[PDB]
Design a protein around this ligand. Sequence first.
Ligand SMILES: CC(=O)N[C@H]1[C@H]([C@H](O)[C@H](O)CO)OC(C(=O)O)=C[C@@H]1O
Length: 381
Amino acid sequence: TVEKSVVFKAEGEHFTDQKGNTIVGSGSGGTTKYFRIPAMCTTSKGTIVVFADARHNTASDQSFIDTAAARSTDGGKTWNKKIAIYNDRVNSKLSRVMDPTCIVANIQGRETILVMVGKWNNNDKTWGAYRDKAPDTDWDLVLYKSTDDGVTFSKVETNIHDIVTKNGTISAMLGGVGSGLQLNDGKLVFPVQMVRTKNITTVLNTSFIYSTDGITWSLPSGYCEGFGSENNIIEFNASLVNNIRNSGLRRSFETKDFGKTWTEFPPMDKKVDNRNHGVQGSTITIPSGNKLVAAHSSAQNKNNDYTRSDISLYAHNLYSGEVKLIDDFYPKVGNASGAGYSCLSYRKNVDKETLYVVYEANGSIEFQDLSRHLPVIKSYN
Ligand SMILES: CC(=O)N[C@H]1[C@H]([C@H](O)[C@H](O)CO)OC(C(=O)O)=C[C@@H]1O
């Protein structure tokens, strides 16, 4: 409901910690240096909540990171900002909570926003390098919830570290990045990515965790293949269908038996090319009369490298398999330090439909209202 705004400004934000002290980052004036990995959830009140890594010192994945949250009640025009989740502060160089996935859901009648992030403290290498232990002792996956429309967040005591430990073949697990979903039966579903222990031949796999209450979670028995593992899931006739990052063409599989076996989903499989290395992308459904349409954002990556230019919106005809570029909403070369991620959010509140996007823009997170494209996306079925 603004057409375009900056949510978090690289070298332009100041945050305080739990005691009220400023967090002196490496940006000019001690600001947070860089923002990455935006996740957006919109509530039934019309409130927009945006999470992102506040990477205080560098754009690097292995650095000092807190999860920042921004809340807008005026359609994305102004943003109220704070830290939603603080890292443990064991190591000032490496302690981090990162890569948010959010869900807005009604759980037993209460509208709740959930945010899940991975947490590390002493690991100095990329998470894919730690495959000895089940799970890695430095890792954890933490879940916070808000029941007051995004204003306060508190930690949820979960059985997630236990189901991973009981599985015995997973070194670490992370959300798929962006947003999860609530199924038509009420269950919460987080798409997940997992690094398997060193003896499993596949390093990475994709799957999901599910819960009825947000507290006790379960893993299905099967695994989808991994590719670039960041992924989202959509519900389509109670198949669950994911859409996975891959170097080159994105992949899409379907489960008809709730996570026991996955087979390629032709309407979305290999339809968008993100070229070299791959990028995270956001995929959601939009109802169109009694049919569904899948809306998707990811980078065109015209330079075929880490600059991941041209973050675009696509519509996927779930019936015919046709794909159409609806809008290249950020038609710029990104910063190779960390670029190209995005998150879509669609909501219809009473009779008002909104389609919003948040994305990485040279270290900052930008917001755009894309609702003007809904007629065109809704026609693709
Ligand atoms: C936890 C973590 O490392 N996440 C990072 C992810 C990961 O490194 C890669 O998917 C290999 O596993 O890569 C990137 C990236 O811009 O490509 C950003 C994420 O923050």
